[PDB]
Amino acid sequence: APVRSLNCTLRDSQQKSLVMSGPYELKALHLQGQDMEQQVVFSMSFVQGEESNDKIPVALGLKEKNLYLSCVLKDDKPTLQLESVDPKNYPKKKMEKRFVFNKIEINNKLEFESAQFPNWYISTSQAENMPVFLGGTKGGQDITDFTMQFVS
Ligand SMILES: OC[C@H]1CN(Cc2ccccc2)CCO1
């Protein structure tokens, strides 16, 4: 049948919100009150892929935008990009592998591992106003843990 999707926001484990940083990048800021209108609303789609109790393959689209987080090699490195797609064809159940993240639940937090690049994770910096990126460490100074908020 149709792919199933949920609207949501994400915040890193230091409670930074995610906002746009130009058309094809996200950044992480400490936000509260009126400025949380700036927060990215995701459509999280539950897609085809290897699955277990605590590890669920998803795509992360921007709500009602033909833009998806994707993992590609750039200048020879696994990177996070925002990629445009044909809005007639997305979302779909069989998303291409660069769009797939394994959403992993550990100790009441979520990590998003690249399905394409094992042990590379959606990451933020400790500093404010820095890009969201793909990080090859889920253990160090960079933040790889998130919480989800469900949106109407
Ligand atoms: O508050 C002014 C901004 C907030 N908006 C976040 C946003 C981005 C993508 C999908 C849903 C929502 C972007 C355009 O307007």
The CATH number given to whatever domain includes residue 99 is 2.80.10.50
Distance 76 CA to ligand 1 centre (A): 31
Q: Measure Cα distances from 50 to 82, 95, 110, 122 in Å.
A: 23, 13, 17, 19
**113: which residues sit within 8 A by CB, 6+ positions away?**
101, 102, 104, 119, 120, 121, 138
Pocket lining: 8 vs ligand 1, CB cutoff 6 Å = no
Determine the 3-state secondary structure of 44 from DSSP. strand
Distance 36 CA to ligand 1 centre (A): 10
Q: Contact at 8 Å (CB) between 111 and 10?
A: no
Nearest to 64 by CA among 38, 96, 41: 41
- The domain tally of the chain equals 1
Nearest to 54 by CA among 113, 100, 104: 104
Please give the residue range of the domain that contains residue 35: 1-152
Distance 38 CA to ligand 1 centre (A): 6
Q: Contact at 8 Å (CB) between 9 and 39?
A: yes
Q: Which of the 8 DSSP states describes residue 33? A: G
d(CA 7, CA 150): 6
Resolution in A: 1.4
Residue nearest to atom 3 of ligand 1 (CA): 38
